[model samples]
Target chain A: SFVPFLEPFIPHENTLLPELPFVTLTYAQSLDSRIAAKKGERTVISHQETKNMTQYLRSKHDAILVGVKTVLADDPGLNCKLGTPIRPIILDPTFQLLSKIASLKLIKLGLSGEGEPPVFITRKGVVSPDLQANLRSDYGISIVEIADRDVHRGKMSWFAILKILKDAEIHSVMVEGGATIINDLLICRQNSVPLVASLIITVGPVYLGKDGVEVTPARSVKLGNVRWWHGIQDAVVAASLEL
Target chain B: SFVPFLEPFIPHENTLLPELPFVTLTYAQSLDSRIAAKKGERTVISHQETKNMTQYLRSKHDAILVGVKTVLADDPGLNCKLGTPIRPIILDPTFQLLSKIASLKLIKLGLSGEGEPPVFITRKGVVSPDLQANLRSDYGISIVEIADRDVHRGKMSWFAILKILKDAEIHSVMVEGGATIINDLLICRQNSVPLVASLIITVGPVYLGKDGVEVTPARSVKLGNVRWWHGIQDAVVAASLEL
Candidate 1:
């Protein structure tokens, strides 16, 4: 019930991953089998553990990586407790993903400074060369490049993204998956970190058209080279390291 | 950092308490280690454990209780999350509590019927006899009077108070220690419910002054016949039942 390790994620260059103990990735799923309930809802109010995990993840990681879909759709401030805020990095091809979000304009007005988490987006090609210059003065902006093959016109390699993240000095990262991001990450380098999940079966009676949704550890675990697994109750199971 | 039980305390009467869940109370304290830095300064920030406790306590019960002090001082919506929109019980003796803060007086101005888990306060030693007459009035007056104590010079037996709350169906109550009310309740014979104490400490060097404050156990946790105790950590000690 008490999470003592949630304060380390601040992006202070002087205090990097090497200065920490353990790196973690945490997230929550839904009974509707979704992080977002209906299309327009993102905050479905998960259980407390899930909520803590969210705040904790924000507090534990030096940076939080997001795609344009999440950014534009959610427009999350990404500030957990905020003593030492993490760098909220967006990975998109030329900010193309962000362009789709209806509330994208608010991002600039919200950011406080240049040292803020840098947003690495590409339109359909590479990192914007004159990012700071061309970017609106609303948000603090920083630009980082991705190799040609890594971005490949925005069909970004999942593994390459992780490598990019590792080089960014983010030893551990949390992936808040929507279908596309989860698919890409799983296909990326096979979950190099850990996935602690909470799955609930809310529709115990009859669910509509019961579409198949499965985390299938025994199957997906092997595909990802999962070294070990733990079954957390019947609904939640975790596989780590090996994959 | 996880608390799932907080949803229950909100509707403690209607709901069965959840198990093994976390529910903590968070608030800033003073150099005196008092929940209030001085009297009335409810906006104090707490240490790590206290913060975690606030987040964790949210998981323990569906509701949370407060004095006009907490709302007027801090303006907290008090939603720790858990599908439980913190049912806050504002105890303002005479509904005079909100008159101190600007943000909350808006409730009075708007005349919002103090919604349930009703916030009750006494006026002239009793809930305003005209409560029914004030319904839907834009006083934003979120107040209720489940019970009125026999005030003998501003003194009421704690037991008399509980009967009031018990009749209102509030069983397991979490008094988030605003100085005056807490001291009143602590020694109240009717306030026999368990005392879940979150120790607050003042910072210091070993050779320093008495500024290193500590949250003390109630003169011996004997609220009614029940008793409980524990060790204090850096914040030390979660006296499940105080002593």
Candidate 2:
């Protein structure tokens, strides 16, 4: 019923390591690897069928992680329709997304008791105690702070974030992106200190051209156990990054 | 057997218009749409199965067109093993590839009568009378010149090249690439003066990173009747560009 082939790829919760979440880095891109028409633009790439596949992927993970830019640009529901709703986790290192949290679809769903409460991961000292309390009390939103040592170039270290999520008992995370997060995860994988367990990409049938924002890693990466599946007008490629 | 799904996408010679050849623009690229690791660097992206598929595609066409850079970088055979060896056409506007012609695989194949003689397309004034005569007399290579009116910037116009090939009775051509040729064909398709009848791309599993030569069109292009096929570790996407 749900993308039947995706079952083998999804890690069982009991099988995941206790130290960190099983991370799946996934995104929909154009044939030219353009994730968006331009930065700050919400470009719809995947057709209805692949969109359903994305929802299926979401349902399989315990938490869906995305950067603040993705939240601002797309305002995605980040909720699954076919299964129980997964937790929505936002990596907002600057805490700039706090003001717009209430208006977000995920928050609205949480408020209506239809979806799990959203979590905001920010750099330490950026979140005021009063604002954190107000958000938790009013919107059921949780603010997660990462220490300065765990932060790098204004972005939180993915290793630290994963450990923190593990401590919170979130066994798996699906990283949906807006470029920055995807590049970071890829960089981590390239350095041989990979945080991702799997990589899945939905390639849509369009060019998006030179001006579109692309998802290019710093170094060429060779994936293992690569597989392809057709999704209407889109092609889904899945592979393992784990050794 | 050959890729059965690709049959409906290929055009019949009788159905082609007499004015110009039916062009099938194609290339193998990394997940990030990179054709090579860098300019002048040969990067093999497609797996062996897709390589065989490419040969099958070549066999179906009367001619296979590529830029001179492709010849210089990879020195591709440009001959199909599945069917009759297709004619090799090189777009060398400045006649820069003449010096390296003898050592190329396609040229050797032509000389041995294992494949058809390769044709060089250049600007009118770029080819010298003596050099052209020597190339034909010694190497069995024919030089086709496009007038200055048909030349734009440093490249001969696709419109002029197609017309020249049509006049030469190259009914259907497969434009395989080294990025420059791919972009030019895409640009032609984008401008609505579509020279290509079908667009087929073999997306390999690896990422060639930021330094790779990318096949980016000038503008976003939405393809019609898009279909996907699995080719070992590669994912082949084919679509119609014809009106």
I-RMSD for candidate 2:
0.9
Name the regions of candidate 2 deviating beyond 4 angstroms: A13-17, A39-42, A189-193, B13-17, B38-42, B189-193
Q: For each candidate, give its TM-score against the true structure.
A: 0.37, 0.94
Task: List clashing residue pairs in candidate 2.
Answer: none
Q: Write the per-residue lDDT of candidate 2 for residues A64-127, one digit (tens) a residue.
A: 9888988887788888887587999998888777778679998998898778899999878787
Candidate 2 residue B72 C-alpha distance from true site, Å: 0.9
Q: What digit string (tens of lDDT, one per residue) describes model 1 on residues B81-182?
A: 334344466666666653453355334323343322235455453544465346325233345543334655765444454445545554445456465555
List, for all models, the DockQ compared with the true complex. 0.01, 0.82
TM-score of predicted structure 2 = 0.94
Residue-wise C-alpha lDDT for candidate 2, range B170-232, written one tens digit per residue: 889999987878887886743455778888898999888889988888877778878788855
TM-score of chain A of each: 0.63, 0.92
